[PDB]
């Protein structure tokens with residue numbers, strides 16, 4: 001998998017962020033998880049072992065950075081927020 | 085000074101003429117009577133969507149303005165502030181981009197609403213003159229790593245048709261130019277709104 005690319009289409013963008021948020025809102029209301037295996041791993045961009053709106057916020061912010069200054073890789077951007 | 089940064093909408097589908105949902109984005113066209121009325125004014129520029137109530141979830145597009153305008157940042161430093169169209173969208177982010185900003189949104193369902201998506205405070209320079217047009221541009225950009233968006237939560241066939249409409253027909257560009265006289269005079273018919281000052285010549 002590529003971290004941040006939860007729809008596995010080779011792009012990190014707002015559709016990844018909306019997808020993580022949608023999964024979080026479903027799980028929050030008690031529906032079963034749809035993100036399993038490498039999808040679940042791709043969603044957990046800050047590596048805190050949970051999928052929540054902080055991951056979705058991070059993907060969206062990367063999408064916006066890559067759309068502007070575009071001066072950091074997605075992997076380096078998500079590592080800024082991962083546990084030492 | 086503004087340049088035409090927009091790109092040709094080239095995803096499949098690129099013809100949104102048959103979209104169920106035809107989103108149109110309007111941008112403030114502020115006109116001052118005299119240079120003295122305009123000089124040093126801060127104008128709230130709204131980016132207002134119509135025809136897509138409850139039809140969208142995921143957005144991302146570029147905004148640029150004439151370099152002579154001074155953006156007045158929010159308290160966080162952001163050049164754009166979300167509006168009422170995005171109040172039911174839990175994800176909303178603005179990233180600064182020189183004489184411009186990138187604005188993006190996300191939602192856990194099709195909670196996108198009609199109305200003001202974003203606002204930008206733009207200040208008219210002290211040496212503004214009668215006749216000046218400060219154009220404001222909404223633009224599509226793409227590169228192989230990512231592109232601009234206006235789709236539904238599932239990113240459905242209809243959401244991709246709606247996106248195609250938004251970028252090709254919903255906003256002005258070099259392929260869908262403005263006929264507004266201020267932008268024609270500005271040689272910026274690719275742009276979408278403006279702050280203008282009347283020339284007031286017979």
Ligand SMILES: [Ca+2]
Nearest residue numbers: 005007009011
């Ligand atoms: Ca993706």
Ligand SMILES: [Ca+2]
Nearest residue numbers: 044048050055
């Ligand atoms: Ca996480």
Ligand SMILES: [Ca+2]
Nearest residue numbers: 222256274275
């Ligand atoms: Ca435009």
